[model samples]
Target: EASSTGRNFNVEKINGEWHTIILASDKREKIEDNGNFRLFLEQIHVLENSLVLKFHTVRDEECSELSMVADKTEKAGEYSVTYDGFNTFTIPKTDYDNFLMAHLINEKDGETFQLMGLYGREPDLSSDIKERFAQLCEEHGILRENIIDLSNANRC
Candidate 1:
């Protein structure tokens, strides 16, 4: 597997509200509807030393919010957090204007899973940006068929 480039990451540009356009994963069930790993993004708050994620999920036909804080690593684009497992999150690709692509690696019970998320300033993203996100996922070993579009999913 390849690691994030971790270069030229601008935290200021990504620190704000955003929408999750699509989510892809090597494990399809993880990103499927009502899946434990399916995350509905609300916003991102960048702190002085840590990055916080405001997420919403549906459970028992109800909506709930989840907050996760990932501490900054030595690299600006990389962060460390433990949720479903020990996760290393990285913003490998982002123009910081229209879209941001985040990659995450979760390790648990000696197993590893790769996940990617495409976030945009709007609920819908341009084809160009989606194409780039697909390409990025392929490079990270996630096939295009595994990419799931969450257009009709509940936003909470």
Candidate 2:
């Protein structure tokens, strides 16, 4: 089972800016160099039943600011968002003050993809933290080689 935060998740604590440290996807093309899903997270605003996200992504070779709202589901750390497809986003692990480990499943035209991301308060995370995230990715079926480190990627 996915190690979702569930009842222990703190919605308020997740508010603020976060940078994408790494990302992994079942499909390599989805998180490979210059993929559309390689978004750099900027901020999260928690609403009553939704979370608003501000992020940067490459569109037509230009960094663009984008925003989306993920509506809360009945489950505590899960939300429904529409982007490239219908997405289910969930927080599997987070320390609130340091890092956030999240899982996402996207469905489009009967095809599905699983993705995981590691975000940090700062643009970089410690080696141990990255190792931990790698293990977590493996637990969810994401191969180590499938993970891409965004630490050195150009930022918006």
Candidate 3:
């Protein structure tokens, strides 16, 4: 089944220094200037020893295509979020797999979900993301099934 995935990267701050800690090998490659395609590191921050970084895909327009890296300094954990950055395609259940694969799986390295669709693990904030994504799907009105569950999936 086609599926989409999300990735989380941690922002690391060691010895009062901030760094964007990449979680996945594939995602690191995407950020590297590989000639074929490249991503730009936009912002980096270290708060309370926690690190946060933002990245954007290199494109002509430089749209709102961006990703974030958040590191839980208190705990030994890191996560990253890499969206399409193009905003050209809407992510529905049918394309959710692809969206997750492209941005969360194929693009970044991280744990994989068993299910074949986007599931929201945190409903409080995820509800917003889901609503926006759903609205986009509705506006585009693509021929695809809308499966929105904000209780079991990660929102990376």
Candidate 4:
């Protein structure tokens, strides 16, 4: 079990399907405070075919940035997930973990201005994907303050 902010998350596989189970209080703060938050399990596209998880955040109803998450094949009997188009980042596979860790650390620092620039510059990474990635970084403690500062400084 993983814990955060008075919440606990568990990695569970039900009927061979993996799920990130989150347990939180009803009174917990949420992005939308309409008193009702929902989680809908959409259709699961087969990995052998086309499995893509796309994310985008809204800014005045204008769509910007596109981030994609694709599941790579897993090892036999082992739950291993790989980044589908991570190679496009031009980052070596060996350093992927380190890079992701840095990103997470930086995200937790709450450098929204820096993240906005990074997402804006990466055309292939949709707004949703970028937002999701930043969230993941924040959760995992992988982001670097210096990188965020550089991004903030280079804003255009």
Candidate 5:
């Protein structure tokens, strides 16, 4: 749930396998009315050998920041269901929950509440996974660190 509006970051599986997600969303009330308004990032499809990443974003005043990221991975190519890339990273099923949590935390805010909620879910959330992700970010490298940091001190 968003601390503010629908523009708040969200993710969900669409049509079974396609992951429809908005890595971040605005809290401003106006962008809320636009039927498709959001910081639309990427839709990922998990496959046997690769993760298909597709970008779909429209140009708007609110999305100007993400517009840069949109162009490189922009929905410009023949959106393939299968990836052509050779290297691949397969996140384990058991660590899926924590990986998602950390990924979102690194990308957006207001997510901490959900993280905290899961944090309260205690035994339900794995300490090992969370611990592992943090160490990698702090030690090795935050595999997901963006080119430019996005954030809001007013939001969390």
Candidate 6:
């Protein structure tokens, strides 16, 4: 595999400080990152190419990818994950083949916030996600230890 499986966020708020925000499911998960948790996604082909994006707090690494793909359905044209509620992909037909966009959502207190509205080409998802994540880190002034890989996707 090229990268790790998924996201394994160690979530918490301490001393009035925040570590990580439990964000959208991304519908895509890793048996590697947080495989044991119910943080993965699926597709129904005969349906509307609609995706069921179910995300949750996590664990770690690639075999994690192994844990998530037991009976997953088909792949949709595009994505953006949400921290809560049912988030659906809303790309127009013309953009499906070449262009892609990810619209992310964030919730706090009671209201909701739209975070990353990233536009990209289909081939450079890694660059896009990595860039967006960095933007997220910059938004919060966080300097971390490990790297976040979304290519192989899940963590081990």
For all candidates in order, the CA lDDT equals: 0.81, 0.86, 0.30, 0.23, 0.25, 0.29
- State the lDDT of candidate 2 residue by residue for 1-156, as single tens digits: 233456655688888989999999999898776676888898999888999999988765578888999998887778999999899998888887889988999999999999999999998999999999999888888888899998876375
For candidate 2, which ten residues in a row score worst on lDDT?
1-10
lDDT of 1 by residue, 15-132 (tens): 7888788999999988887687888787889888788898888775578888999998886568899998899888777777677788989999999998999988777788887888
TM-score of 4: 0.21
Clashes of each: 0, 0, 21, 23, 2, 26
* Per-residue lDDT of candidate 4, residues 113-136 (tens digit): 111112222123334534544455
Q: Candidate 2: misplaced stretches above 4 Å? A: 1-4, 59-61
Candidate 6: regions farther than 4 A off: 1-50, 53-58, 62-89, 92-94, 106-109, 115-149, 152-156
Ranking by lDDT: 2, 1, 3, 6, 5, 4
Pairs of colliding residues, candidate 2: none
Q: Can you give the lDDT of residue 3 in candidate 4?
A: 19
For candidate 1, list the clashing residue pairs, or say none: none
* TM-score of every model versus the real structure: 0.89, 0.92, 0.26, 0.21, 0.26, 0.30
Q: Which candidate achieves the best lDDT against the true structure?
A: 2
Off by over 4 Å in 4: 1-44, 64-69, 73-156
Q: At residue 127, what lDDT does model 2 achieve? A: 95
Q: Which candidate is the best by TM-score?
A: 2
lDDT (tens digit, per residue) of candidate 3 on 1-156: 232111223222111211121112222333333422243333445575333545444344443445454433222332333343311111122221112211222332443221112222112333454454444434433222432332321122
Deviating ranges (above 4 Å) for candidate 5 = 1-41, 56-94, 101-132, 141-156
